[PDB]
Structures are given as structure tokens and as C-alpha cells.
């Protein structure tokens, strides 16, 4: 009842719904439904995830040492490619 | 166990109706048995060993 | 750079990423149910419900 509202109303980007979302695909899916692209200034910034914020948040604010890259490399490739960071995803996949 | 409800809910109801009694190890043995008899029908090896 | 910066194309990347993640969970929920059919009680009615 939290998670379905956090999706449909794009609210509490500050909650991960981790009593339902145990996994990285469900974290990606939750936050990707929470994305806006649109500068509607009636939205408060504490509810306001842009794709650009989420791209940086994976690549720079968590990074390759959060996703345990040597043990789950295709999961970090999945994280970058499903956030359309294709150039960084290729630079990564070309190191291994 | 036969008609395949989960025993966990009736095992807990049998405890509220007891102020403090033995009615616990029979309920644990019943859950241990529920999982064992389900393992016999389960065809996913991973699930069966789980 | 103008195609990758478009609002429309960045909506399309996220619309496809959500479709991939949803069909991924559809594969996982299918496999989970088809292994455990005796618990699952799937019956004889097709559909995601």
C-alpha cells in the first residue's frame, strides 16, 4: 500500500520500499517509475527524481565498489544500460 | 497438510487459546512434516533441497 | 547528442527499461509458479492476474 502509491504518485524517493523490493531490478523499476523529465515547478524537490539525478546516483554516488563489480559485473552493466548510460556501460564492459 | 492450506496460521491459533502449555512442539513437528510431505510433490530440485 | 538529450527519446529509454524489467519479473514469476505448481494452484485460466 506504500509502494503502489510511491509509484503512481511519484513520491518519497527517500524510501526504497525494501519490505517489498529486496533486489536491484526492483530498485531500478521503483526509481524508474518515479522519474520525471518535466520542469513542473508545482512539484517539491524532495519528491523530484530526474533521470539525470538517477544516472549520477548510480555512476558517482554509489559506483563500482557498491555493486561488487568483480562478482556481479553483468548486474552493474544492467544498472548502467537500463539507465541509458551506454558509453559508461561500454567503457566498463571493455575493462574486463 | 492434505488439502494444502499453510499450517502456520492454525499452529499459531492453537497457542493463543493456551495460557502456557505443551501445544508448541506438536505444532513445530507439524510444520516440519508439512514441509517434508510438500518436498515429495515438489519437482524443482532447488526448491526441494530448500 | 540532440537525440540522446531529447525529452521524448529519454522517455522512450525509460519506457523500454521498465518494459524489460517487467517482462524479466514475468519470466521469474512464471518459472517460480511452474516449478512450485502444487503450492501455486494455477488451475486452467491464462492471464497475469
Amino acid at each position: 500500500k506504500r509502494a503502489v502509491y510511491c509509484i503512481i504518485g511519484r513520491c518519497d524517493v527517500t524510501d526504497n520500499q525494501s519490505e517489498v523490493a529486496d533486489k536491484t531490478e526492483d530498485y531500478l523499476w521503483l526509481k524508474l517509475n518515479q522519474v520525471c523529465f518535466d520542469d513542473d515547478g508545482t512539484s517539491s524537490p524532495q519528491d523530484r527524481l530526474t533521470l539525470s539525478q538517477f544516472q549520477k546516483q548510480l555512476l558517482e554516488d554509489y559506483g563500482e565498489s557498491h555493486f561488487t563489480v568483480n562478482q556481479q559485473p553483468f548486474l552493474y552493466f544492467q544498472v548502467l544500460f537500463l539507465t541509458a548510460q551506454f558509453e559508461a556501460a561500454v567503457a566498463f564492459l571493455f575493462r574486463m | 497438510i492434505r488439502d494444502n492450506a499453510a499450517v502456520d496460521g492454525i499452529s499459531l491459533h492453537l497457542q493463543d487459546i493456551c495460557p502456557l502449555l505443551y501445544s508448541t512442539d506438536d505444532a513445530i513437528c507439524s510444520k516440519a512434516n508439512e514441509l517434508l510431505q510438500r518436498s515429495r510433490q515438489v519437482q524443482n530440485k532447488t526448491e526441494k533441497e530448500r | 547528442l540532440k537525440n540522446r538529450s531529447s525529452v521524448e527519446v529519454r522517455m522512450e529509454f525509460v519506457r523500454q527499461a521498465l518494459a524489460y524489467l517487467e517482462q524479466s519479473y514475468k519470466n521469474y514469476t512464471l518459472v517460480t509458479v511452474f516449478g512450485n505448481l502444487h503450492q501455486a494452484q494455477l488451475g486452467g485460466v491464462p492471464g497475469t492476474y
Binding site: 527517500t14 526504497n16 525494501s18 523490493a21 529486496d22 533486489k23 536491484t24 531490478e25 526492483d26 530498485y27 548510480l58 554509489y62 557498491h66 555493486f67 561488487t68 556481479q72 548486474l75 544492467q78 | 530440485k45 532447488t46 533441497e49 530448500r50 | 524479466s24 519479473y25 521469474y28 518459472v31 517460480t32
Partner: peptide, 24 residues
């Protein structure tokens, strides 16, 4: 808390076993 989990959905399917030689 705000940081992600590091797991796929297929982790429930990839449980330990022989991986190989599928008979019957």
C-alpha cells in the same frame, strides 16, 4: 537505507546444485 540492494531476481533460481548433465 537509501543505497540499493546488490542482487538479481534470478538468484532464487540459481541456487546451488550440479549445474550440468541434464537427464530424464
Amino acid at each position: 537505507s537509501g543505497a540499493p540492494p546488490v542482487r538479481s531476481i534470478y538468484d532464487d533460481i540459481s541456487s546451488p546444485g550440479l549445474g550440468s548433465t541434464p537427464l530424464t
